[PDB]
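Protocol check, entry for the methods section draft. Step 1: assemble the input record (protein sequence plus ligand SMILES). Step 2: submit for complex structure prediction. Step 3: store the structure tokens unaltered in the notebook. Ligand used here: magnesium ion. Step 1 record:
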Amino acid sequence: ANFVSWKSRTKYTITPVKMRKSGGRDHTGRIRVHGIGGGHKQRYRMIDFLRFRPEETKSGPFEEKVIQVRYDPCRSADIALVAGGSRKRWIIATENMQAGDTILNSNHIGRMAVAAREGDAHPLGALPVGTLINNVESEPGRGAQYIRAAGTCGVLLRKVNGTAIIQLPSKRQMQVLETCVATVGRVSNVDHNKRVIGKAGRNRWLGKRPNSGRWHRKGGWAGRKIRPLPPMKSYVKLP
Amino acid sequence: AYEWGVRSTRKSEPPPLDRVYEIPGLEPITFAGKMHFVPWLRPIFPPWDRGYKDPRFYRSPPLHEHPLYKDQACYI
Amino acid sequence: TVIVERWWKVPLAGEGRKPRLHRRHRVYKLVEDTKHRPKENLELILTQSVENVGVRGDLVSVKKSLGRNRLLPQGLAVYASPENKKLFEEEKLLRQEG
Amino acid sequence: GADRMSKWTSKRGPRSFRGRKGRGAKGIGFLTSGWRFVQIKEMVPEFVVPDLTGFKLKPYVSYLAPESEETPLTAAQLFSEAVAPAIEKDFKDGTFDPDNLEKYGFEPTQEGKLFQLYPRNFLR
Amino acid sequence: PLHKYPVWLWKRLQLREGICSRLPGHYLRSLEEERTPTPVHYRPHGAKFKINPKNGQRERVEDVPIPIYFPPESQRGLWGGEGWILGQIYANNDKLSKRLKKVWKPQLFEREFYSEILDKKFTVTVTMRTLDLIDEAYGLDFYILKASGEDLCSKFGMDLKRGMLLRLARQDPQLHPEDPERRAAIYDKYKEFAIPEEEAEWVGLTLEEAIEKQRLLEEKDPVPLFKIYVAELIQQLQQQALS
RNA sequence: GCUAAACCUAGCCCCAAACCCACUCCACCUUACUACCAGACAACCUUAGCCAAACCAUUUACCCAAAUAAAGUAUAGGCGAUA
RNA sequence: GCUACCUAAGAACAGCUAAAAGAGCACACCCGUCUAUGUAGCAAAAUAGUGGGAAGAUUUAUAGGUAGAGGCGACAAACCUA
RNA sequence: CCUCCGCAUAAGCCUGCGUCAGAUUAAAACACUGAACUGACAAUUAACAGCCCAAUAUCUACAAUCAACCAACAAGUCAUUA
RNA sequence: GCCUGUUUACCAAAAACAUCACCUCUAGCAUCACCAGUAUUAGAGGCACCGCCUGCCCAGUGACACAUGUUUAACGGCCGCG
RNA sequence: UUAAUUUAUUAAUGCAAACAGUAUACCAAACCUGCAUUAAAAAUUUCGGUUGGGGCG
Ligand SMILES: [Mg+2]
Ligand SMILES: [Mg+2]
Ligand SMILES: [Mg+2]
Ligand SMILES: [Mg+2]
Ligand SMILES: [Mg+2]
Ligand SMILES: [Mg+2]
Ligand SMILES: [Mg+2]
Ligand SMILES: [Mg+2]
Ligand SMILES: [Mg+2]
Ligand SMILES: [Mg+2]
Ligand SMILES: [Mg+2]
Ligand SMILES: [Mg+2]
Ligand SMILES: [Mg+2]
Ligand SMILES: [Mg+2]
Ligand SMILES: [Mg+2]
Ligand SMILES: [Mg+2]
Ligand SMILES: [Mg+2]
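Step 3, stored output:
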């Protein structure tokens, strides 16, 4: 069962990379996830989610200029080609971000707040309270893993002695260290909720096989569960 | 950061050498004398290079000891 | 160390022969575990002055964890063998004099 | 079912199997980039023929030739007919040394010459 | 028809046939030893005869061992004399319920050990029984030189034993120079040991390693017939010369 | 009277004794029978069940140390079939 | 190597009306609603007529993968060399 | 008189209606002599198609649809330098 | 039965299964699937476009809460005599 | 399956072992090992007789 993964590219490149579908089959060859496979072909645009990484031999904050705002097939929110200095890279795009615009990639955690635009990225210690943020890390320098999908956004709630507390779009709160960078504003491509599929052919185009037809009886879990919101998730380490 | 080299597609690290190479003053009895793999142990091979240079199997020198290497970058 | 006795009574095969087993002599019964035992302590002779667990020269029973992790690897003690017992009591006999 | 018993020749597989098989001819070069074949003249065998002009020896023998006993050549016989008079003679003059055997035809190692015997450099 | 020799004697016949015959004899004794291990996973009987209840008549009693299975991680590090117990179990300790198969694995630890003879710190996948046995033997080196071939249950133990025995047999520059009195002290400490040098090399080998070692000993690319024949010739002329 | 019928001898079986074999030249782990090039991965694991107990749920000889005897005895066993 | 699904890189779809189109008539092709013949038949499931689709959730050439206490399945308890 | 066939490539098989002799026999569902054959003899000749690339770094955002307006979604089938 | 479509190859092509739409439940997350994705997301399911609606019940079971509770678009139930 | 037996397997817990400070007291990080409990998922096996045929009685 020869399954060598398609993600074998050790250098970051702007060029779209050929990707192989899997069909829900893991490395053994059996299905692990049902109802996936056989869509239109796609290519992968390597997104850089560490929004503040300086260029080589440059250290401080740096500026960047938007070139295009494309459509990425591999996600919901569309992406943006961004150029600055002597390199280009794909980043996730925010709402009202068009071409030619100039965005900031800051590191300096100021004394007071900074009245920031809907594009640029500051550390969470410098952002004003109540700001709508997205693409937050969980550790300083990890990379954006939370809010990324189309039109989703997290609010910054309070800034405490060495942390900042974030509310995810699932409303579960999450505190993180003060120096974690996060971009401002909602992610692009709102009204992704309002998409109508229209026919079963589009669901086959997206790469999704239909549901199986065996009638399963609903058990105890199927009722509406009114639960309390889960306790806050802490990534701040304490000795 | 997010490193782009997936572990399954990278070159695997070799297995840890068998424990006879930690015992001092003791030489192991390995299959280098029979020129084929068996189980039960493993040798350590010296580096090899071609004595006579071959144009179809030529390997370049590393880049900072090319004779045209400059520290400052030019832009073609 | 898991100790097990055999249920089903292997039937006593010879003196110069090996016992003949059946697949009912593979049925065991746990007679004791060697964990879940009150752990005894070992004896060490100390070569250096330490904190309240002892002074240099006199042997002392300490817990096996402490004696195996701190006292013996850091050279603070020696095993209480009959060999070095003799040299340590001789050094006691020469340190304290007439 | 396919034909198991008849042997696997070069005429049998698909279009990729044909060409990769060959019939046993020893190759004389290598394939370069643009599917070109580069012949190397030192790999193609050069037939070393002599001049048969004034040669007096026929493919058959006359029946009037007498017979004799067969004796296959042995290494002791080759030693006795090749080296033993020379070593015997220069031992009678007392100049024989066991240290240098190379002056009687012995070679210490075959690594130097062109026709080395034990790994069999030469063809036939 | 029938074989001449039984099937279980073909191993000893293969030892007497070929290159295995040319192994040294003390290695052949140590290979054909076949001695019993000390009890680990069971309690042995006290006496040879055990008067039993329900009739006061004495019976012979033997103690048969448990067939314990040693995985290759037991060969990588010093376990005790213990391994896995692949066996079976009646459910609630009465024989009128189901029979279930049970595996008793030992508890493993990772502790660093020092050796006074090798002067090196090893990381070993030790268990608790080995720690107690090292404490009972007053050292790692005494534990490895003391305990026999059947009780280590590890090839790492036999490699350590051959290394220590070679260090004792050679009287090598062990610790380093600038301290030869410590070398003399450590070599004098473990002196109730130290088999000869030609016997210390064959300690703890498998059969395949010893076969390969003896094969490498007599490797010996052959002599050309020129030297043999010139020796015979000059011997013949010396024989004809002196008469 | 046509189809037909008849044959002995290739060989084989069970034992005893004895431990038994393997490169003429070339090719043969890749698509075996292929003359010729850079990741080196690597083996060590309680048999189960049919069946008997007139079902079946613990249980049921098969295990590789010459014979005979002790003896089908002491023992084990839904103390039962049986071992 | 049939078949159920998936992966890699391919191929095919005359003509007319094209409302824009998992649109309409209709070839090649895929499938098999009904009738008749056949039932040791051409065929261990065919033939002739009549039918549905035929720019798509389509059909198909090559290679590979998922295997039985399982694989796969738009659930027929369907298929896994008649 | 029929043609819904045919000529090629790929896949598959491996000499399987070329000559002479036997045709007394044998398979031709019968025969001549040849597709349900015996022995011998002789052919398929590469430019068509296979069989490939010396390294270390570095570069590769603007589909195809006469690609020119218009218009999109399922976001795509092709490139180098030191 | 919303439609195109899918199935018992070889007696059942359908009102059966799927289908856009709606709803319930689970999950705060990095490298071999899901995914080189992040709660306008992914998975487990019911029902079946659209239009009007989806009434009452937590006694019991299951699930979730451990504050005797919450949950029916969870399993299910929605009276008798004169 | 809400029939009998069982949890060999996974997931949770609790105890023990393993580690460390800690002023006569408290805390027990993560992974393995043994034991005990619960659940999910399973494994083996069975499904009496008379009966003016069988079933109901
Ligand atoms: Mg659904
Ligand atoms: Mg359904
Ligand atoms: Mg006897
Ligand atoms: Mg029975
Ligand atoms: Mg019977
Ligand atoms: Mg259409
Ligand atoms: Mg039509
Ligand atoms: Mg289908
Ligand atoms: Mg059904
Ligand atoms: Mg329908
Ligand atoms: Mg049918
Ligand atoms: Mg069909
Ligand atoms: Mg039908
Ligand atoms: Mg339906
Ligand atoms: Mg309702
Ligand atoms: Mg009856
Ligand atoms: Mg009746």
